[PDB]
Design a protein around this ligand. Structure first.
Ligand SMILES: OC[C@H]1O[C@@](CO)(O[C@H]2O[C@H](CO)[C@@H](O)[C@H](O)[C@H]2O)[C@@H](O)[C@@H]1O
Ligand SMILES: OC[C@H]1O[C@@](CO)(O[C@H]2O[C@H](CO)[C@@H](O)[C@H](O)[C@H]2O)[C@@H](O)[C@@H]1O
Ligand SMILES: OC[C@H]1O[C@@](CO)(O[C@H]2O[C@H](CO)[C@@H](O)[C@H](O)[C@H]2O)[C@@H](O)[C@@H]1O
Ligand SMILES: O=N[O-]
Ligand SMILES: O=N[O-]
Ligand SMILES: O=N[O-]
Ligand SMILES: [Cu+2]
Ligand SMILES: [Cu+2]
Ligand SMILES: [Cu+2]
Ligand SMILES: [Cu+2]
Ligand SMILES: [Cu+2]
Ligand SMILES: [Cu+2]
Lengths: 334, 334, 334
């Protein structure tokens, strides 16, 4: 029935985002994406703790999909026979059938093709949701990502002015529940199925062992720090499919923030810390003013420093002594 | 002193809401309500776990009271001699005397009549609050509900347009703290008083055993699913008197959301997930576009699927293939 | 370089706030503050539990600093040799160098002078952040306060009208993690260093033993209740540097609330309960209408009544029977 142009997208792994237009002169298209599910044992911390992950496209989070209002998003979801469990996909951006979940349940060896019309603007979670107790389990095992539905005119500040980002990053935050043995050491398991009973018991107590960005402690640091230059406006999309978070850019601000993540609402301005409700994505833009290292955290600092939820930015440019200066370096008290 | 017309309301059990006008041509009235406290042992899950509940009018939540701005709400609170504890009522909608609590403490065998002027619009929690450590205990035992204070012109979108709902439901969410024995089984108690010491010990650790809507796992499912038709605008009032929640309609959206719950503020539009602060009520309206089953959850999915916090809607009407379609059903991967 | 007038401020202990102008005709100044760090063992509850606190200026929270937009805030941070640990300061109001943290690390015996330009309006957290796991530890040991950056025209309601407070209070909320021995009694330690291992173990489990205002259970009660008169507009700044909170004035409202705390955004109106994201300050103003006692709580009532997070207001003036009246005092049920 649907006679619109088709456009394929090559997804890229987080924190990066596939190339896209903000404002566009294109009309509605059918935008084609493929997600291939991978169950895999991964390392989640610098001590070598392992984790039975379940992923879209091999990553935690799943990749960010970007379209415009009124596009149709046509996703081929693939569950190779090398996996063990059924899986599906629920898009919080979509209308009907439990977000798509009720139309996309696939066993290992199967694939399905779902299309949904992007009638709601903003950033949105997508996640697996097979049914019943498997819903939380698949999500906290890593099976969640996000989609961004941009207005065709790009972003605005609510107050007729355009808001154009120079780059966008996607920070997916994951609460993880790794049980401990009697000794006190994290357990390892041979399969997701084998991990389930201990992992569910822990899940129901509502305290994660790890809270990470991009799948691992320290993922968005070192060589893989986020980057910017003084003068660049950076959009940071943050999602959390199961649990609240409170993002904060240490040494910066949220110049324009959509903490509930939906572009039909004006952004708030000049925030210190914002709030991502579990089950949502939000977005914050900041124009960097100072060079150096920044930390991007959830501002439960226990979670940030001790459980894994810290990213860095390395920013190049000229220091601004008007905005901040060390008037007197550390010295003995007179 | 107060020479206004009197109108009696027949309260109805949640999730339903007593009949009322949205926009009205009536002026201020004294609106009369009666709440009769019932302490009772109830079943809270499908395994037969019991719970020492304390209720207004026999239900968890207490019933939704609906009035208009500038009405006077005159409540007869009754504590029959068949109860064991003193009780009172605090309305977050009311001004003075700890919300009414300091004027309504009644022993078993007593009743009291409180009137308050509805000067604040929105949805608001009401709850018992006897004093000291009894405050949390009575609330988490079930002694909380909500009141809705509508503008006389009905609801609006902030942007001069009216927002009329076709039906309203009240979802009261309850965090419950049921201790376990050494075996690991939930305990049962012969009285609220007997439950108190174990229950307080658990409460202070801040992790509920159950998180339920309408008093029980599965209460708002099966025969008792919420209902709608495609085309109907449904208002969903959600309250949580003690603990945060993050509502989400799976397969839908919040078209217009007052997450802080107060009609003097414009609603936000197009939300995926919203946030009910513990100690508050909020409200979301959605116009259904697709038939079928929806789940209405808190989007801590552990809480939703594993601890009790899932409701269903069953929606009738015609499927819209433009909004969503299964392009290719599950098939073997080529 | 910077040729502006200098003004010294004499800080005062919370909940009070040093004298300041709301609207001002002054232009930018260099506003001088001194903070002297004190590590000390303190009592945190009415049972005599002790706690290894780390403070700015001897108090939990640290004192509220008040300036205007475009001022330069020049802080002399002093770490006397009588302390044991290095410390620094991070201002969420400031731009660059991890909020100042990367320019203010001082060993015992040292001081440093940092200046930052107040380019963002609102209330903001400041806290110590030495590095790594020490960050959460120093914060939850008490090393956090707030700064308020007022517009030069004072506050407004977003809707061209001025919002002038008659008084302001600063409520700093502190999550504390005091371990227990095998007996079940809270432990005491001889130094912060000695407390660290047990305290970190507890911290990572994310459940505080105490949640207090102004450093201690009951601090803002009795002789030290907050006060007001009927007719007075009171601004209540609330901060939480590590963990969410949900403030509520029992028997009142938030007439004008900036829950995210930033004056570039209009306030919300008529709230029952608001939300302070961990890592932030927010503010609420209320004009008292009724005399008597009010409780100001976080509306996790377990935290409020059982873990320490309750303040009182004692309000003088004439009772308003129009707003609320006890129509019939407690009596036997007919
Ligand atoms: O930023 C969204 C916010 O801005 C307003 C104007 O105050 O509308 C702008 O954004 C709409 C969505 O992109 C545009 O359709 C509109 O033309 C533009 O003025 C608000 O209505 C909206 O909530
Ligand atoms: O929806 C409330 C929001 O809308 C505004 C207009 O932007 O005011 C509308 O709602 C008021 C409350 O019902 C009415 O009194 C007013 O006449 C109407 O325009 C905002 O002022 C308000 O925050
Ligand atoms: O309260 C802030 C809110 O109000 C608006 C007007 O709707 O702007 C007022 O506040 C600004 C900041 O103080 C002033 O510069 C402006 O002149 C005044 O109208 C909004 O723009 C702002 O979000
Ligand atoms: O701003 N530092 O957590
Ligand atoms: O949208 N599903 O949790
Ligand atoms: O309003 N009382 O918690
Ligand atoms: Cu899955
Ligand atoms: Cu979901
Ligand atoms: Cu009671
Ligand atoms: Cu209350
Ligand atoms: Cu310190
Ligand atoms: Cu910080």
């Amino acid at each position: 029935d649907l006679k619109l142009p088709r456009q394929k997208v090559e997804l890229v792994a987080p924190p990066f985002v596939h190339a896209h237009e903000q404002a566009t002169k294109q009309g509605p298209k059918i935008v084609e994406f493929k997600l291939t599910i991978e169950e895999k044992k991964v390392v989640i911390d610098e001590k070598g703790t392992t984790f039975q992950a379940m992923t879209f496209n091999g990553s935690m989070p799943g990749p960010l999909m970007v379209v415009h209002e009124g596009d149709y998003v046509e996703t081929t979801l693939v569950n190779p026979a090398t996996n063990t469990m059924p899986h599906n996909i629920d898009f919080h951006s979509a209308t009907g059938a439990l977000g798509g979940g009720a139309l996309t349940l696939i066993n290992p060896g199967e694939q399905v093709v779902l299309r949904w019309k992007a009638t709601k603007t903003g950033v949105f979670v997508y996640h697996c949701a097979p049914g019943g107790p498997m819903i939380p389990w698949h999500v906290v095992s890593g099976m969640n990502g996000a989609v961004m539905v941009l207005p065709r005119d790009g972003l605005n500040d609510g107050k007729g002015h355009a808001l154009k980002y120079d780059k966008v990053y996607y920070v997916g935050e994951q609460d993880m529940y790794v049980p401990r043995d009697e000794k006190g050491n994290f357990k390892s398991y041979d399969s997701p199925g084998e991990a389930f009973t201990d992992t569910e018991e822990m899940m129901k107590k509502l305290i994660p062992s790890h809270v990470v960005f991009n799948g691992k402690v320290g993922a968005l640091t070192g060589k893989n720090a986020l980057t910017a230059n003084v003068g660049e406006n950076v959009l940071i999309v943050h999602s959390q499919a199961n649990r609240d978070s409170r993002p904060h850019l240490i040494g910066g601000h949220g110049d324009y923030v959509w903490e509930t993540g939906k572009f039909g609402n004006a952004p708030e301005v000049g925030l210190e810390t914002w709030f991502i409700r579990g089950g949502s994505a939000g977005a914050a833009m900041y124009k960097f003013m100072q060079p150096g290292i920044y930390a991007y955290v959830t501002h439960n600092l226990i979670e940030a420093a001790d459980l894994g939820a810290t990213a860095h930015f390395k920013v190049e440019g000229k220091w601004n002594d008007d905005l901040m200066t060390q008037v007197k370096a550390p010295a003995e008290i007179p």
